[PDB]
Structure formats: structure tokens, C-alpha cells
């Protein structure tokens, strides 16, 4: 289930982090306008960039702690507040988070792993709701 999937991702975090984030950027290529130096590059050229692996692992490090601190896929309001008040997230609306979780769930449903993809969908939805309550447009 959801709690298990957390441990699964954390067991091979950078690989899942890069692969899921690549799924997101390939599903929604105009999302790359929020990042610097990601455009014009294939999967293998994002992966030999130093910052891509590092930054993206940090993203999922935090995503897994937010998931881990959740109850029944409901994230802490304090975790949503952190995500909204991060300088690096100042350009975002909740719709950017919706796209990420749509791509995440799609990735899980296509993988050869026994993920609980319905829970990740509930979690993405609950996080969007929480981001709105914490004041993200």
C-alpha cells in the first residue's frame, strides 16, 4: 500500500526520483519553463547534468517525508505551508502540483511494481486541497 510505496521509493530514491520527474516533464514539456537549463535536452543529457539528479532527489526526499507524515493520505497543513512559502515555489499554482501527480500515478500504473497508485492519486488531490488552504493560487 501507500505506506509501503514510501519505503519502496526510498530504497532506490534517485532512480525513482529521476524517472518520475522525467515522466512529468515528458508528459507536460511546458513545465520545464519553471526550471533553468532543462529545455532542449533528452532523458540521458538531463541525467548527466549534475544539478538534475541532485535537485530532483531533494524534491522526492521531501515528497516522501510529506507522504510519510500524512494520515490516510492527508498531508499535514504545516507541510503544505512549507511547500507554498518556499522561494523556489513562488511562481507556482496548485495546477502545477495536480500535473505532477497525474504523471506520478501514470508512471506507477505502467511500472512492473505493485504500487498503490489510487492512494497516490488521493494523496496528490489532498495535497492540492491543502496547498489551496495554505493560500497557493
- Please report, as ranges, the residues that interact with a copy of itself according to CB under 8 A: 71-74, 77, 122, 126, 129
Question: Does position 92 bind ligand HEM by CB under 6 A?
Answer: yes
Cα dihedral 124→64→21→93 (10° resolution): 40
- Range in contact with ligand HEM (rule: CB under 6 A) among 15-23, 41-49, 81-89, 115-123: 81-89
Answer for which of 20, 22, 100, 128 binds ligand HEM (CB under 6 A) is 100
Residue 74: φ, ψ to 5°? -100, 115
Answer for which of 41, 55, 122, 125 binds ligand HEM (CB under 6 A) is 55
Give the bridge partners for 74, in sequence order.
71
Longest alpha-carbon distance in the chain: 40
CB of 111 or CB of 126, closer to a copy of itself: 126
Question: Does position 31 bind ligand HEM by CB under 6 A?
Answer: yes
| 137/132 Cα distance (integer angstroms) | 6
85 is in an annotated binding site: no
Radius of gyration of the chain measured on its C-alpha atoms: 14
60 is in an annotated binding site: no
Amino acid at each position: 500500500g501507500f505506506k509501503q510505496d514510501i519505503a519502496t521509493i526510498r530504497g532506490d530514491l534517485r532512480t525513482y526520483a529521476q524517472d518520475i520527474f522525467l515522466a512529468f516533464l515528458n508528459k507536460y514539456p511546458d513545465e520545464r519553463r519553471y526550471f533553468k537549463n532543462y529545455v532542449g535536452k533528452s532523458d540521458q543529457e538531463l541525467k548527466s547534468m549534475a544539478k538534475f539528479g541532485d535537485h530532483t532527489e531533494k524534491v522526492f526526499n521531501l515528497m516522501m517525508e510529506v507522504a510519510d507524515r500524512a494520515t490516510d493520505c492527508v498531508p499535514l497543513a504545516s507541510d503544505a505551508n512549507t511547500l507554498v512559502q518556499m522561494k523556489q515555489h513562488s511562481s507556482l499554482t496548485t495546477g502545477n502540483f495536480e500535473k505532477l501527480f497525474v504523471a506520478l500515478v501514470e508512471y506507477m500504473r505502467a511500472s512492473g511494481q505493485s504500487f498503490d497508485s489510487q492512494s497516490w492519486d488521493r494523496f496528490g488531490k489532498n495535497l492540492v486541497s491543502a496547498l489551496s488552504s495554505a493560500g497557493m493560487k
